[PDB]
Design a protein around this ligand. Structure first.
Ligand code: 588
Length: 282
């Protein structure tokens, strides 16, 4: 029972200690491509890079680099591409990735501006009649429809490979209420958002991996993938109480560094799973 464990950590207020154990135990792999001088402007943060072994490669002989990692969860049979919020100069790379990986959905967990500064480039069109064209990767993006709700917005986008004239519908799930500081009060809206993404089929095997990002693509984005996999596993195993969130996180960290950046985010992940289980259980 993780809820029982949850209350113990709370009781003895040892979240930071536990979060630190995970940090210490976390995998560590080379990120040589990410560090090449030629890719300096393709990274938002100097200390956030994709491991070479799990990085997403753009299908171009020029520079195949993009700060994105493929998190493959074998047992849960779920895959996620975690990436950084695109930069002014990497929006075309971003959509090129979405196209080449055949993703069905993009999940955004932050706002373009937070705390008064830019945390992500405006990579999608805001008005139907004003489509976007990424000349460097030869892609066209058009806002087809938008549905603004209280805690999130879902947008229907059309991505066109100008080279082949081929087009695909891309769903953009934007969680718009994540607080500037800290984590949400309750995982309720976050969980609802998660189920909305699921219900769309964007997380399903018939499509490429969903693309998930926030600013660095490790903290909030980690919370999303962690909660989803844990819930899925509790649904798959005949003994749901065997699902160990700390274990799941360490496994995910083998594919991208620093998923879950604070003790608050860790605690929140527990809440989300526990609360999500009480509902998803039936
Ligand atoms: C693995 C390497 C990490 C080493 C530390 N590096 C950093 O914090 C940063 C990168 C970095 C790492 C994690 C961040 N973070 C995230 O959840 C996220 O965006 O992935 C959050 C982190 C903590 C709390 C909240 C958030 C958040 O956005 O919710 C953020 C976002 C902060 C913000 N909202 O302004 C930035 N690098 S640098 C050059 O020192 O600035």
């Amino acid at each position: 029972e993780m809820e029982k464990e949850f209350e113990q950590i709370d009781k003895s207020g040892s979240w930071a200690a536990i979060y630190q154990d995970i940090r210490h135990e976390a995998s560590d792999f080379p990120c040589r491509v990410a560090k090449l001088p030629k890719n300096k402007n393709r990274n938002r943060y100097r200390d956030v890079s994709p491991f070479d072994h799990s990085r997403i490669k753009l299908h171009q002989e020029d520079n195949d680099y993009i700060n994105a990692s493929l998190i493959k969860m074998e047992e849960a049979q779920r895959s996620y591409i975690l990436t950084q919020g695109p930069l002014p100069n990497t929006c075309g790379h971003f959509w090129e990735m979405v196209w080449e990986q055949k993703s069905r959905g993009v999940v955004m967990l932050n706002r373009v501006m937070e705390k008064g500064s830019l945390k992500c480039a405006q990579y999608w069109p805001q008005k139907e009649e004003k489509e976007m064209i990424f000349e460097d990767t030869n892609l066209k993006l058009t806002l087809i429809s938008e549905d603004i709700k209280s805690y999130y917005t879902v947008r229907q986008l059309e991505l066109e490979n100008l080279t082949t004239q081929e087009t695909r519908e891309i769903l953009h799930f934007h969680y718009t209420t994540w607080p500037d500081f800290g984590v949400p009060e309750s995982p309720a809206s976050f969980l609802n958002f998660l189920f909305k993404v699921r219900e769309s089929g964007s997380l399903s095997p018939e499509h490429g991996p969903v693309v998930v990002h926030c600013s660095a693509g490790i903290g909030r984005s980690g919370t999303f993938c962690l909660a989803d996999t844990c819930l899925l596993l509790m649904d798959k195993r005949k003994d749901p109480s065997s699902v160990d969130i700390k274990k799941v996180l360490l496994e995910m960290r083998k594919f991208r560094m620093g998923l879950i950046q604070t003790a608050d985010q860790l605690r929140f992940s527990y809440l989300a799973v526990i609360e999500g289980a009480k509902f998803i259980m039936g």
